[model samples]
Each structure stands twice: as C-alpha cells, then as structure tokens.
Target chain A: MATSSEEVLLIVKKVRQKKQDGALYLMAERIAWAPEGKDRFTISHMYADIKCQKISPEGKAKIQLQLVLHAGDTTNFHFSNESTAVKERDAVKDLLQQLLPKFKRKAN
Target chain B: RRRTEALGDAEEDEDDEDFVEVPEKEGYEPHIPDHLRPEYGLEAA
Candidate 1:
C-alpha cells in the first residue's frame, strides 16, 4: 500500500498527541497493527521493550537512560528508573512522544 | 548492492525458529510502579 507524505504525517501527529496525553502504551499498541506497508514499530516496540532499572528491597534509586540512534535504522533506549513506576512510565511517554517524530521527519 | 544485502538478510529465518521452537523461558515480570492494569484494553500486554 502506497502512502502519501500527508498520511504519514497524520499518523505521526496522532502518536505524539496520544503520548503527550499519557497514553503511550495504548497508542503504541494500535500502531503495531497498522496497514502492512506502514506497519512501522517505533511506538509499539517501545511499549514492549522499555526497561527500567532493577529495584531491590533495600531502596536505592538506579534510574538511568541511554538513547542510541542508528542514523537510518532505529534508536535503542537503555532506560532504568529508580523512582516510582509512575515516574518511569511518564518519562518514557515524554521521551518517545518528543523523539519519535524527529526520527520520522529526519528519515524522510 | 544495498538492496541485495537487505534481501539476503530478510530471507534468513532466525525469527521463525525463535518464535516457533524456542520454549519461552520465563523470567521475572518486573514491577511497573503505580500503573494499574486496565482491564478494558490490553492487547499491548
């Protein structure tokens, strides 16, 4: 299926909107099943792959985030949050909402 | 040359083998802080 540039932009805008509204996982899950040619996995894959730093009963914060971009292919974010789960999820939502559009625009 | 390389890589079947044959080795299901499980829509899980 061929996609005009506008259709692509529309989807990008939708994803960002959802992310900013604190619905990253929900929006991403939908993107996982877009039409075949446009079935990109940027948002969906992140929902599944985002990882937080391990926590122990001893109460230590080990939050860490390392994002690596492969120029044309993909960006891998090594994330670890030593805070409340709410904070970790929010941080990921904000990061992806902001970053995914940049990559999509850059790739074009 | 790039297209040829990409096609060759695409033809490889490691993903199929991993999904079909490898019995899922379970590990810790790490805790998600303060995130409640929403019963209505969970295809993401």
Candidate 2:
C-alpha cells in the first residue's frame, strides 16, 4: 500500500482454479490472478496478508499451490507441467520463505 | 515534460539481489536465455 512502484515479478500462465483459467502473478507486494483476455486482477493477496503457502504432493497429477491467509481463508492455485510446474512452484516456495518472515509480527 | 517515453529499453538486466525468474509474459527477464537456463537451474524444450 505504498507507491505504484509495485513490481510484477513472475507470472505463470494456464494456472487454474474454480474451473477457471488465468495467469498467476507474483509481485513486489502481492500475488494476484487475472483471467485470460483481461488485464485486470480479480484476486489479490499482499505478502503481509498471507500466513503461508502450500503445494500439492510431489506425485500428484496437478501441480498446485495454496496461499493460506491470516483471515483464515485459503486460495488454492493450480499449475500444470505442460513438466516445469514443479520447478516454478519450488522457486515460489523458496522466495516466500524468504519474504514472509520480513512481515511477521513481533509476537509470532 | 515531453520526456518522450523510452519505456521498453528503460533498463537492462543486471542480476540484482533478487532471485528472479523469466517472465512467462512477453517482454520479461533474468537476462540469461532458457537454452542456457539449466546451467543456472532449469529445463526448457
């Protein structure tokens, strides 16, 4: 919630959820999703608003991700190999591992 | 201030502190090419 300097980091295409298709955006301050054919986001979660993130089983069919939030809601994001999904997800996980703690409360 | 927009080539990659990924969208970076990616850590076909 600072400047418009919010950078667009990474984007995964063909990412699906709720039986829908869109590109998942990993940004400087938040993560978001914008459905295909549209440039606007319908989903947005600031890094500070997220509790943690999750991924599907290594052996699972769909390469999936879960964003657990402080408000007690989980937004599951799905990615497919098309076989590079897992790698990308790992990068996300590692990056978040580095990011989230920077926003942690003193008591947590 | 008609500082004519020179947006596209604004800045080139410099391998900043961030562990960046190539943007799946057009006009993105990481500077390194995908064919050379595995050397950096990746797969492309």
Candidate 1 lDDT over residue span B1-45, tens digit each: 877574532221111111111111123233568566576585576
The most accurate candidate by TM-score is 2
Under CAPRI classification, how is model 2 graded?
Answer: incorrect
| TM-scores, chain B, all models | 0.15, 0.14
Model 1: per-residue lDDT, tens digit, A5-105?
22121121111121111112324322221322343333333322422111111122222222223232232221222234335433443444443443333
| Candidate 2's TM-score | 0.62
**Steric clash count of candidate 2:** 0
DockQ values of all predictions: 0.02, 0.02
Per model, how many backbone clashes are there? Answer: 2, 0
Q: How big is the positional error of residue B29 in model 1, measured in Å on the Cα after superposition?
A: 30
For model 1, the superposed segments whose C-alpha errors exceed 4 Å read A1-79, A99-104, B1-45
| Segments in model 2 whose C-alpha atoms lie over 4 Å from true places | A1-5, A81-83, A106-108, B1-45
